[PDB]
Ligand binder design. Structure first.
Ligand SMILES: CNCCN1CCC(c2cc(CN(C)C(=O)c3cccc(Oc4ccccc4)c3)ccn2)CC1
Ligand SMILES: CNCCN1CCC(c2cc(CN(C)C(=O)c3cccc(Oc4ccccc4)c3)ccn2)CC1
Ligand SMILES: Nc1ncnc2c1ncn2[C@@H]1O[C@H](CSCC[C@H](N)C(=O)O)[C@@H](O)[C@H]1O
Ligand SMILES: Nc1ncnc2c1ncn2[C@@H]1O[C@H](CSCC[C@H](N)C(=O)O)[C@@H](O)[C@H]1O
Lengths: 330, 331
C-alpha cells in the first residue's frame, strides 16, 4: 500500500495520466456537457491526484467539491486550488476515502479508478466504498464499466515466449547445462499478461462483455469476477489467447459520454491486454470457443486470472493462470 | 525487502544478468585464471542467483561451495546443481547471508553485489557482512570497487528533462493553471538519476575516483559515503551534471582482472548513471569545479545523494539532491 501511494505521489505519474488526451479530454467533455449534473451541486472526487477532475467539476458550476487523495499529491492539489483561486469551492481532504470524514453528503461522485483490464489495482472498490457519502438517487461518473473479451490469433507473440525461454535450453552456458530450467522459464513467461496494442484483424470472434453498474455494485462484488464466454468463430485459425479492453460510460441528464480503450479506438495509456493460452486451440469458422475467465482478487492489490477454454466441436481444451500484477509491456 | 527478493526470484531477471557477457565472462576469467585461489578451497557465494558464479568456482577446482540465496531462485539453483551432477561440491543454502549458519569458515567469498553507481540496493553491506565467515588469510572476489565521477555537458539531455518538468509551467492546461507547481516538478524530475550510455566526448574533465577495499571495509562504512572532488576543467562549456561509473578488481594470487562499466569500455547492463544539475554551471577551460558528493544510506535499500558543486573562479554554485531509488532509464 505504501509503494502504491508513493507512486501516485510523483508529479510525473500524475502528468502521464493528465497527458492522455483521450482520457483527460473525455472526462472534461463528460462533465461540461452534463453541466446540470454539476451546477450548484456537491461533488466527491475519489482520488483527486492533481485535482484535475475537480477543476472540471468547478468549470461545470459545482458549488462544493471534496477532493480526497491518499498520496502526498494532496499537498500539490492544495497548492493548485489556492493558486487557481478556488479555495471556497474545492476542499482537498488528505487520506484514504475509506478513512477520512466528509462534512456532508454529495450529489455526485467523480473518479478515474480504472486499471488495466478495468479492475487492476482494485481502486474501483474504493470508488464503490465512497457511495457511503452519496445522497439517495445521487449519480456516479463514470456510471458503468464494460470489460470486453475476444479470442485472437498471434503466431509471433506465441512463438516469442519459447524464443525467450530457450536461453535456458543450452548444454554449456559458460560450461553450465541450463536445460533443466527451460520448463520453469516457459511457465514464468506465460503467467504475464501482455500490455500493448494490436491490429483488429487478429481478433477471431465478436467480443463478449461483462458490465458493472457502479450505481448498484457493492465492493465485495469485485472480489470474484466470473466471465463466461461462448465465442462463435468468424475465422478459421489457431486461437492463441484472449484480448481484453474496457469502456466506461458517463450517464448524465443531458447525454451519455463514453471513454473507450478498445483497439478500434485511438490509443490510451491503458493500451489493451492479452492473455495467452498455454497451448493454442484450433477452431474453424462457425465453431464455438467456450469457457470462463475468472478474476480472483488478491492481497497485492490485483487479480489472479484463470482462463479455461475449449472448442466445443473437438473437445480440445486449454487453460492459463496469469498474474495481473506482473504484466509484460511489449 | 519482500519485493526485492521477489524480483530476483524471476528467471527472466537472472537471465538479464547472465546474458551480460562482459559481466559473466569477466567473472569467469577472474575465477578460472586465478584457479589456485579456488583449488581445494572452501568458497562462499553471496547471493548465488542461478548458481552461475558457484559453477565457476567448481570449474576452478573448489572443494566445497556454499551458495547462499534468499530468493526463491535458491530452488532453481539446486535444480541446476543436481542436473550438472555437482551435488558433491555446491551446497545451496536458502536464506539471507546474515541469518543462515554455515558449518565452516571459508577461504574466499565471491559475489556480484554491485548496483547502479556501485552502491544501489545496498547488497555490498551483505557482501561485507559475510566476512564473519572469512578465514584470516582469505580473499574476496571482487576485492576492491572504484567509483568514478566526471563533469559532463549534454544540452539535449538537460532540455529533455527540463521540458518534461515544464509541463507544470502551463498556465491553462484544460483551463487550469499548473504554474504554481513548476518548482516542485523541476525538483522531482532533477532528483532522478539518468541511466543510459553516452559518448565520452561529453566529459569535461578527468574523473575523480573513490575506492572501497572490500577486504578492509566494514558494513557500517557504507552508510555514509563522502566523495570530495576538484575537477580541472579541460573544456569550456556548460556543466550539466556529474556522470558516474564503476570498476571492480579481482585481485587474485596469480593475476588481477578488472570488470569495468566505464563509457570507454563495452556496454554492460549497468550502463552509466548521470546526476543532472537543475541549472548548469558555466565553466572555462582551466577553471576548477570543486565540491562534494555525499551518499547517505536510507531504509529503502538505497541512497539519498547530495551533490554540491561550485566553479571556484566565479562562485557559481549548484546544490542537488537525488533519489538513487528513482532512476530514469532513457531510450
Ligand atoms: C488511476 N487510473 C489509471 C492508472 N494508469 C496509470 C498508472 C499505471 C500504473 C499503476 C501502478 C500502480 N502501483 C504503483 C502499484 O503498486 C500496483 C498495484 C496493483 C497492481 C499493479 O499492477 C501493475 C504492475 C506493473 C505496471 C502497472 C501496473 C501495480 C504502477 C505502474 N503504473 C496504470 C494505468
Ligand atoms: C546484482 N547486481 C546487478 C543488478 N542489476 C540487475 C538488476 C537491476 C534491478 C534491480 C532491482 C532491485 N530491486 C528489486 C529493488 O527492489 C530495489 C532496491 C533498492 C533500490 C532499487 O533501485 C532501482 C529502482 C528502479 C530500477 C532499478 C533499481 C531497487 C530492481 C530493478 N532492476 C539492477 C542491476
Ligand atoms: N482509497 C483511496 N483513497 C484516496 N485516494 C486514492 C485511493 N486509491 C487511490 N487513490 C488515488 O487515486 C488516484 C488515481 S489516479 C487519477 C488522478 C486524477 N483523479 C486524474 O484523473 O487525473 C491516485 O492519485 C491515487 O493516489
Ligand atoms: N543478503 C542476501 N542474502 C542472500 N542473497 C542475497 C542477499 N542480497 C541479495 N541476494 C541475492 O543476490 C543476488 C544478486 S544478483 C547476482 C546473481 C548471481 N550471483 C550472478 O552473478 O549472476 C540475487 O539473486 C539476490 O536475491
Amino acid at each position: 500500500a505504501v509503494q502504491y501511494f508513493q507512486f501516485y505521489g510523483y508529479l510525473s505519474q500524475q502528468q502521464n495520466m493528465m497527458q492522455d488526451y483521450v482520457r483527460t479530454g473525455t472526462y472534461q467533455r463528460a462533465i461540461l456537457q452534463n453541466h446540470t449534473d454539476f451546477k450548484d451541486k456537491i461533488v466527491l472526487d475519489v482520488g483527486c491526484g492533481s485535482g484535475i477532475l475537480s477543476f472540471f467539476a468547478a468549470q461545470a458550476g459545482a458549488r462544493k467539491i471534496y477532493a480526497v487523495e491518499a498520496s502526498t499529491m494532496a499537498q500539490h492539489a492544495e497548492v493548485l486550488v489556492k493558486s487557481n483561486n478556488l479555495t471556497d469551492r474545492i476542499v482537498v481532504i488528505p487520506g484514504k476515502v475509506e478513512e477520512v470524514s466528509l462534512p456532508e453528503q454529495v450529489d455526485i461522485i467523480i473518479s478515474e479508478p480504472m486499471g488495466y483490464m478495468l479492475f487492476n489495482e482494485r481502486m474501483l472498490e474504493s470508488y464503490l466504498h465512497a457511495k457511503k457519502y452519496l445522497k439517495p438517487s445521487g449519480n456516479m461518473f463514470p456510471t458503468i464499466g464494460d470489460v470486453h473479451l475476444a479470442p485472437f490469433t498471434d503466431e509471433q507473440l506465441y512463438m516469442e515466449q519459447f524464443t525467450k525461454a530457450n536461453f535456458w535450453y543450452q548444454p554449456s552456458f559458460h560450461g553450465v547445462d541450463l536445460s533443466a530450467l527451460r520448463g520453469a522459464a516457459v511457465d514464468e513467461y506465460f503467467r504475464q499478461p501482455v500490455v500493448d496494442t494490436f491490429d483488429i484483424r487478429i481478433l477471431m470472434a465478436k467480443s463478449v462483455k461483462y458490465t458493472v453498474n457502479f450505481l448498484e455494485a457493492k465492493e465485495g462484488d469485485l472480489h470474484r469476477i466470473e466471465i463466461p464466454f461462448k465465442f462463435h468463430m468468424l475465422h478459421s485459425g489457431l486461437v492463441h489467447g484472449l484480448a481484453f479492453w474496457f469502456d466506461v460510460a458517463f450517464i448524465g441528464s443531458i447525454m451519455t459520454v463514453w471513454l473507450s480503450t478498445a483497439p478500434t479506438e485511438p490509443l490510451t495509456h491503458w493500451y489493451q491486454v492479452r492473455c495467452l493460452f498455454q497451448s493454442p486451440l484450433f477452431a474453424k469458422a462457425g465453431d464455438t470457443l467456450s469457457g470462463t475467465c475468472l478474476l480472483i482478487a488478491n492481497k497485492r492489490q490485483s487479480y489472479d486470472i484463470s482462463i479455461v477454454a475449449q472448442v466445443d466441436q473437438t473437445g480440445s481444451k486449454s487453460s492459463n493462470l496469469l498474474d495481473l500484477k506482473n504484466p509484460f509491456f511489449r
